[PDB]
Design a protein around this nucleic acid. Structure first.
Ligand SMILES: [Mn+2]
Lengths: 161, 612
DNA sequence: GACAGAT
């Protein structure tokens, strides 16, 4: 819905392309922003996203993120435990999330215990970065005061060992 | 005229103890025709009549299974005939001790018989062996009266022994049959597999000629443990994790090494950014302080497994050597029975008196005198398995009286005994938490307040450390330096003898007197070589055998079949399954498994060709 | 010519 829908998505923090919003929508006769959100959480961001994250974010020249934006997790690894003993409790859990808006990729690190995100969080889940998020050496620093897990159900293919 | 009753036990010490308890100190003792077995005599009442009591003891098992003659030739028969068509008789074990002749001579004229064997399955089996040896030489039954009796006891105490003599029962043929089935199964599997393997590999590889390759329900899993550890060592990929430690100057010349709360980081860029946050920070900040007063628990009563573990780890002796030394000490009368799984002292044990014997040795004279003056501590409650009491010193000894190797085992045993009765080690744990930039660090230290059992066991002592400086929250301390360290994950080392004994105890492989033999057996057949630090390194022969078994039949190495088969044999003990069917059913299962092993033996050859 | 495990 043109300007009002664009403003609603912009305020909600979902930055999607014009083609993405015109395709991911359903029932063109009647739909609502909540319906677009519900159907968007279940779609891969790589096919519907729009370019918001500044270019060369992994260079260390950007130290701040302004505004709320929603990004999609690709893979999660516990950097405080070895590859074989991924569940080892000998060290506090620290997660290195890789995050995408569809085009550019960024890396975030768990700077403080996040109970919502775990090692079993499936790829494709959506996280909203509310507030000011600080980027040190190209690494976003995540906390409980700037990350909200909005869920998401996209084709997993995570499989197992 | 007075009827004589035989009172067979299982070991001379137990026979003497029970005779002393029952005879209230009116024994008449003389040695039998073995030297290792003694006959005690006294007088008492049985079934309301005056009778004479003849206490005797066997020296363990009396019989052992063996094939008749042909199936002992190794060339006239093939191993496949050792499962169903190989009759087995029972011959005499330890022929040096004329057990059958001694029992017959002692029973030459007895009327009744009371059988004081230890209350377990092997005890019942030896009970029926003794009964089969002694019955055909007795004085027969006048009428419908009973003749064979059984006494059940849980501990060697006056009240328990008197009660056991008060209430008498009958032996358990079901447990006897269960033990017989286990013995027959072990013989028929081990012999067949060994004669196939050693006669196949001696005809193809000349390096293995005049060498015995053996298979068994216990030694094969024992070797499999070490081979699994070797495989884990081989399939190891080291990593390059980074740590971050900082030094803080608390005083003008005092420096403290802090530890990162985030213990490790496996990403170089993440470690670098964390260091970047903490480079240009020259003022630390204290946040937390802890003064918890913990304690170190005193050791439990000495177990045979723990004794073997400590002898292998600290003293530096093999399991069989330690067992032989303990047996020599026990025979000489210095330590109590060294083959028990009881870690809980009896309620009537004379701790205060056994401690008073070790009151003149200069090594620990001060500790014992202080302990008896201010009272002793009640030993920790533990597991009572119905076996003999835990290994404790029974007589004073000096390094001159004992040798250079029996003294070291004695010294550890008596220092363990005092530790179990001494107090607990109380120490003060102090931690100070620091804020260096956006990160946190901790420094921990221990201060001993009142040493306890560490005085008699110095190796289990809290290491001496400098006391942490006194401070409260808000203090600012100059920061010395912050650095990263490129550490690497260390590969695991080869399995040690102490670690292997724990593994066998968990999986039920080997009893108290069989664990030392199995470790020595696989060492004598060149399966594993004992290295520095008592590490068991598998050889090329051991690796080929275990790896070959997994390819063909996993159920011959897995440390679970031994417990699984033992559970099946307990059905005969409880009467839920007859002895004939279970033995036949299990033999056919392994006989089918034997044929697959023979037909698929070409698998092990392709691994053996590389080595030899 | 040797074997198994157990006291
Ligand atoms: Mn026993």
């Amino acid at each position: 819905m043109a300007q009002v829908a664009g403003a609603a998505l912009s305020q909600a923090g979902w930055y999607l392309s014009d083609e993405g919003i015109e395709a991911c929508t359903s029932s063109p006769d009647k739909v609502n922003v909540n319906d677009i959100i519900l159907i968007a959480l279940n779609t891969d961001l790589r096919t519907i996203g729009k370019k918001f994250l500044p270019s060369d974010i992994n260079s260390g020249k950007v130290e701040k993120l302004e505004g709320p934006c929603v990004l999609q997790i690709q893979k999660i690894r516990n950097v405080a435990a070895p590859k074989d003993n991924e569940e080892s409790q000998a060290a506090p859990r620290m997660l290195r999330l890789q995050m995408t808006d569809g085009h550019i990729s960024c890396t975030a690190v768990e700077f403080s215990y996040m109970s919502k995100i775990s090692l079993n969080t499936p790829p494709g889940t959506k996280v909203k970065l509310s507030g000011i998020v600080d980027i040190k050496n190209g690494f976003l620093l995540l906390n409980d005061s700037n990350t909200t897990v909005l869920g998401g159900e996209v084709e997993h293919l995570i499989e197992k060992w | 005229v007075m009827k004589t009753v035989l009172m067979v036990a299982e070991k001379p010490s137990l026979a003497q103890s029970i005779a002393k308890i029952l005879s209230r100190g009116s024994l008449s003792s003389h040695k039998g025709l073995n030297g290792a077995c003694s006959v005690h005599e006294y007088t008492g009442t049985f079934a309301g009549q005056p009778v004479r009591f003849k206490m005797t003891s066997v020296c363990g098992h009396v019989m052992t299974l063996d094939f008749l003659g042909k199936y002992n030739k190794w060339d006239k028969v093939d191993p496949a005939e050792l499962f169903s068509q190989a009759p087995t008789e029972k011959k005499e074990a330890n022929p040096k001790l004329n057990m059958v002749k001694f029992l017959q001579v002692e029973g030459r004229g007895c009327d009744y018989i009371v059988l004081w064997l230890d209350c377990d399955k092997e005890g019942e089996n030896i009970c029926f062996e003794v009964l089969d040896a002694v019955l055909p030489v007795m004085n027969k039954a006048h009428g419908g009266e009973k003749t064979v009796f059984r006494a059940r006891f849980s501990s060697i105490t006056d009240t328990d022994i008197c009660n056991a003599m008060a209430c008498l029962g009958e032996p358990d043929h079901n447990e006897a049959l269960s033990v017989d089935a286990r013995q027959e199964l072990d013989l028929r599997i081990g012999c067949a597999f060994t004669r196939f393997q050693t006669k196949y590999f001696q005809g193809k590889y000349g390096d293995l000629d005049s060498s015995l390759i053996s298979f068994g329900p216990c030694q094969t899993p024992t070797l499999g443990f070490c081979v699994e550890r070797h495989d884990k060592i081989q399939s190891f990929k080291p990593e390059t994790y980074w740590v971050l430690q900082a030094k803080v100057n608390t005083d003008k010349d005092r420096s403290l090494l802090l530890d990162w709360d985030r213990v490790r980081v496996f990403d170089r860029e993440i470690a670098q950014m964390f260091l970047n946050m903490t480079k240009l920070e020259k003022e630390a900040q204290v946040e937390a302080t802890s003064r918890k007063e913990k304690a170190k628990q005193r050791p439990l009563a000495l177990n045979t497994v723990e004794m073997l573990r400590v002898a292998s780890s600290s003293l530096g002796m093999g399991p069989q050597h330690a067992m032989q030394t303990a047996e020599r000490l026990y025979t000489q009368g210095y330590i109590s029975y060294p083959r028990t799984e009881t870690t809980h002292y009896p309620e009537n044990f004379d701790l205060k008196g056994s401690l008073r014997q070790q009151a003149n040795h200069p090594y620990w004279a001060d500790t014992v005198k202080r302990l008896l003056a201010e009272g002793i501590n009640r030993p920790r409650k533990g597991h009572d398995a119905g076996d003999h009491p835990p290994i404790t010193p029974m007589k004073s000894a000096t390094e001159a009286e004992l040798g250079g190797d029996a003294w070291r085992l004695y010294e550890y045993i008596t220092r363990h005994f005092i530790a179990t009765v001494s107090h607990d080690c109380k120490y003060l744990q102090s931690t100070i938490s620091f804020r260096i930039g956006p990160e946190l660090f901790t420094c921990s230290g221990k201060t001993v307040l009142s040493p306890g059992f560490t005085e008699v066991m110095p190796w289990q002592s809290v290491p001496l450390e400098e006391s942490l400086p006194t401070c409260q929250r808000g203090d600012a301390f100059p920061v010395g330096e912050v650095k990263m360290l490129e550490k690497q994950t260390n590969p695991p080392d080869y399995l040690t003898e102490a670690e292997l004994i724990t593994l066998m105890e968990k999986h039920g492989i080997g009893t108290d007197a069989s664990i030392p033999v199995h470790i020595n057996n696989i060492c004598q057949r060149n399966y594993v070589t004992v290295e520095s630090g008592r590490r068991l390194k598998p050889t090329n022969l051991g690796i080929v055998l275990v790896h070959g078994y997994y390819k063909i039949d996993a159920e011959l190495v897995l440390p679970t079949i031994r417990s699984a088969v033992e559970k099946q044999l307990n059905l005969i003990a409880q009467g839920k399954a007859d002895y004939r069917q279970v033995l036949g059913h299990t033999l056919d299962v392994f006989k089918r498994k034997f044929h697959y092993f023979v037909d698929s033996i070409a698998g092990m050859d392709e691994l053996m060709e590389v080595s030899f």
